[PDB]
Structure formats: structure tokens, C-alpha cells
Scaffold this active site. Structure first.
Site, mmCIF file in Angstrom:
data_model
loop_
_atom_site.group_PDB
_atom_site.id
_atom_site.type_symbol
_atom_site.label_atom_id
_atom_site.label_comp_id
_atom_site.label_asym_id
_atom_site.label_seq_id
_atom_site.Cartn_x
_atom_site.Cartn_y
_atom_site.Cartn_z
ATOM 1 N N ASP A 34 -33.590 6.105 126.688
ATOM 2 C CA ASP A 34 -33.310 6.690 125.410
ATOM 3 C C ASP A 34 -34.603 7.299 124.927
ATOM 4 O OD1 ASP A 34 -32.556 7.334 122.774
ATOM 5 O OD2 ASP A 34 -31.951 5.291 122.295
ATOM 6 N N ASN A 72 -34.696 9.244 122.360
ATOM 7 C CA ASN A 72 -34.537 9.359 120.923
ATOM 8 C C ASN A 72 -34.883 10.752 120.394
ATOM 9 O OD1 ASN A 72 -33.511 7.337 119.044
ATOM 10 N ND2 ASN A 72 -34.849 5.934 120.165
#
Ligand SMILES: [Mg+2]
Length: 258
Positions: free
Chosen positions: A150, A152
């Protein structure tokens, strides 16, 4: 022989376990499963979470109980794992597993979310910076590298449903997107974009307001490889229909050296 790697920010391992996790895992049969956001003291886990038949599991928790944390299930154990960049403030949040396999290093990274504050944002960007230092050293050594997890951040406008409304929202800040540009210019490839140039291809949707149903999502999860290894990438895809988290899993298939 191919190697299948799945990465999934599970939004809590216990949480995802209650929503069809082990059935999915058994049915997908990855050689390596990289997980983010375990949110569990590895000892607190029932032995059928942390033990899955046929896999060695490795858990890298945060110092803070119930926060963050990553995990790797792999049929074949790595020769070892590193759990940090050698920089203590990036190394104690349960965000980093760097597993040394035969053909490659596998970074399984839970990149920080920068939304809560300007401090968390600086944290994220410097985390990015230290990550880039780490991975460049290794592939400069001659290591082929796979990075998943991830990030983000949605890279380009195609990578989320509402680029305009998020221009000044962590996840889609020019500075964040510019980091991925720089990351890519250092000779890394966003593998999903090797095979799929389509819009509307996301890996995270807010749990709220039927976001997943309206496909109001962001592609926050990636598999990157270094340029020199990209020839080995056979597939890179999003398991869009797999439920149980606010993220869906993502997949990579690579061909092993004989
Ligand atoms: Mg979460």
C-alpha cells in the site's frame, strides 16, 4: 515454473479472517502472500491465522499494539528477512518486510498514510525517501527487486475516481505523485500499467457511501519491479471482486529462473 505473489492491505487480519480470508487464500494458492495492516500482536493470533498449512509465516508488527503491521506467507522460506531500512523511525511502525528470495528481494511495504497531519505527511515523504535509498542500493548491488504493498498514493489522474477534488488531499498531492515519478525514473516499473492502461482500476474504496459499489476508488496498492527484472513479469492484476477489506488484493505472476 511461475511464482504468484498477492499483496493485500487486509484492514486488520482478525477482521479479514471473519470475512472469508482463509477460504480466499486456499482458493487463490499464491506462492507468496504479502499482507499489510495486520493490526495484531502476532502472539494474539489463533494458530490457524498465523499457521496456514503449506506456508511459512513471518509477522512484522509495530511497537504500538493493534496498529499497522505487515505479514508474509510464503511456501518457500526466504533466506532471511529485514524489517527495516536501518533507520529507526521508519523501522518500528510494522511497515517493512524485505524478504530475500532466490531470484529477487521482495519488499512488502505498508507506506504511511499522510492524511492525519503535516507531521504524518512529512513522515510519509521521508519514508518514501528512505525506501528509495534502500531499494536503489539493493538493485545497484545487482539484486532484482519486487516491491508491493500500500503506497497510499494514487500515481496519475487515471489512478483515482476524483483527481480534481483530491488535488490537495494526501493520497493525491503533487509532491506525492512526483515522488512516484522520481521512483519510476530510478528504473522501476509500475507493473499493473505494463498490461492494463484502463481507467477505473482501483484497489481502495472508502467503506462509506457505497464507494466500492460506485467504484469511487483509488489505486493505492502496487507491484513495482526494477527495469532489469520486468521481462520476468508475466501478469499484474487487481483482484477487484475479492471482499473483506476496504482494499482489494493485487497480484503478480513472474517466471522463475530454472
Ligand atoms: Mg485500515
Amino acid at each position: 515454473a511461475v511464482l504468484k505473489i498477492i499483496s493485500w492491505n487486509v484492514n486488520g487480519l482478525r477482521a479479514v479472517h471473519r470475512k472469508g480470508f482463509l477460504k480466499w487464500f486456499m482458493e487463490e494458492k499464491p506462492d507468496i502472500l504479502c499482507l499489510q495492516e495486520i493490526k495484531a500482536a502476532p502472539e494474539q493470533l489463533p494458530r490457524k491465522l498465523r499457521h496456514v498449512e503449506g506456508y511459512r509465516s513471518f509477522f512484522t508488527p509495530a511497537e504500538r499494539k493493534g496498529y499497522s503491521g505487515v505479514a508474509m506467507y510464503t511456501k518457500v522460506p526466504p533466506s532471511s528477512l529485514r524489517e527495516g531500512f536501518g533507520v529507526e523511525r521508519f523501522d518500528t511502525e510494522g511497515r517493512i518486510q524485505i524478504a530475500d528470495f532466490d531470484d529477487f528481494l521482495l519488499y512488502n511495504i505498508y507506506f504511511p498514510n499522510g492524511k492525519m497531519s503535516e507531521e504524518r505527511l512529512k513522515y510519509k515523504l521521508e519514508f518514501y525517501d528512505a525506501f528509495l535509498e534502500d531499494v536503489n542500493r539493493e538493485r545497484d548491488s545487482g539484486r532484482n527487486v519486487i516491491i508491493c504493498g500500500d503506497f497510499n498514493t494514487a500515481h496519475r489522474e487515471i489512478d483515482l475516481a476524483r483527481p480534481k477534488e483530491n488535488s490537495n488531499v494526501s493520497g493525491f498531492l503533487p509532491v506525492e505523485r512526483a515522488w512516484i515519478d522520481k521512483f519510476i525514473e530510478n528504473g522501476y516499473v509500475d507493473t499493473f500499467r505494463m498490461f492494463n492502461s484502463d481507467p477505473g482500476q482501483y484497489t481502495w474504496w472508502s467503506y462509506r457511501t457505497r464507494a466500492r459499489e460506485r467504484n469511487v476508488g483509488w489505486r493505492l496498492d502496487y507491484f513495482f519491479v526494477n527495469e532489469e527484472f520486468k521481462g520476468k513479469v508475466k501478469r499484474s492484476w487487481i483482484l477487484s471482486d475479492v471482499m473483506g477489506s476496504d482494499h482489494c488484493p493485487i497480484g503478480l505472476e513472474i517466471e522463475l529462473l530454472e
